[PDB]
Amino acid sequence: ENRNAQTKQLQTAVSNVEKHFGELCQIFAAYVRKTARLRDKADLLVNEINAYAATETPHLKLGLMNFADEFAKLQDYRQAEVERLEAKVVEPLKTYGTIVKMKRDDLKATLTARNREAKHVISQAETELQRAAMDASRTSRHLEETINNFERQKMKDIKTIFSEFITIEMLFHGKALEVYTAAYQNIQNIDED
Amino acid sequence: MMRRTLENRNAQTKQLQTAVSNVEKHFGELCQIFAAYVRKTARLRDKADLLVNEINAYAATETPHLKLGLMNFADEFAKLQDYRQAEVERLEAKVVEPLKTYGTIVKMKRDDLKATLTARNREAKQLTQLERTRQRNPSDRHVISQAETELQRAAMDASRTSRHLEETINNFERQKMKDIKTIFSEFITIEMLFHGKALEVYTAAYQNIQNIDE
């Protein structure tokens, strides 16, 4: 029905996703890197608490070492958060560079194929009319289905990717809460004798 | 006994200097690592702010329902970053700065040990010089009397100093224990508060992202 409008609609949708998913990808990747750098410093904190504990009196040494044990455990969970974020948030967003490329390549091929084939006067005009009618019908069916699928998949994927980010963070914060709730007690039960 | 007071003065001096050096080394290391931890937490907060901005920028381009859901998620995530910033500031105030104060506490302890040791060095010179004088004129009634006066005074000063050292050691250690418990209790409480707020924000954000395809 409207080739200029369907074409523009598809190019605008794929280009918008390309730009914004690509930007989300690199910021998520940076967020993951910063999370790992925080985990490095927490690891140094584990090592120093144990090194100081080693020099101290029994009750204080024990309480600090027990706290270091919990805090070290938390940093294994942080490392697992780091790895799940890269696997389930960053990598799927990076995959959209390829999806967008395939969508553009299919649009170009769609219009090139119908063009290649196209390349008395009344009979010639009738054959070209018939061909144009067939191609208009097939191309507009195809463009419509490509647009509708792209948009449905983009929504599914956005929901998945942000739902995974949120799930991964909730699980880490949930573990952190229960570790810190435990660690509080053994710092508090360091007997001042 | 004088033998015991002089021995206990020397043992307490060594005990205090060893403890002061230990606290200095390890509290100073904790100080700079906690400070680095706070900095990395702020750097993560920076990256999260940029994500807020890009989620909003992408939402601005989108269809009604999807725009609404993404901007709602960005608001929640931005509020989380305000809590992270408050975590950063409280860690600095209640964990890093109390550890940093120990550089001053340690400096004051060392200055006092140095002051005591220079006084003891001056007194020891005086005492050995007086004994050299006595050996060179041992029947001098006035040197005999100076020596008797110096014996009593040094004995009294040894007792007062070891009494001083004992209270200084006991205060430093009692305070060190109180402070380390306070500092680690604050760190845990501050994090536990952030993690609880984060869990509560994400639980809301999760439920709302799921209605995005509606």
Residue numbers in the entry:
A (entry chain A): 7 to 125, 142 to 215
B (entry chain B): 1 to 214
Paper quotes:
FAM92A1, also named CIBAR1, is a BAR domain protein that functions in important processes involving membrane remodeling, such as mitochondrial crista ultrastructure and ciliogenesis.
Thus, to elucidate the structural basis for its membrane remodeling activity, we purified and crystallized the FAM92A1 N-terminal region (residues 1–219). The crystal structure of FAM92A1 BAR domain was solved at 2.03 Å resolution. In the asymmetric unit of the crystals, two FAM92A1 BAR domain monomers assembled via a two-fold symmetric interface, yielding a banana-shaped homo-dimer characteristic for BAR-domain proteins. The overall dimensions of the dimeric BAR domain are 150 Å in total length and ca. 25 Å in diameter around the center of the six-helical dimer bundle. Specifically, the angle between the α2 helices of the two chains in the FAM92A1 BAR domain is 33.2°, a value that is consistent with other classical BAR domains, including N-BAR domain proteins. Furthermore, an analysis of the electrostatic potential surface of the FAM92A1 BAR domain revealed the characteristic accumulation of positive electrostatic potential/charge on the concave surface.
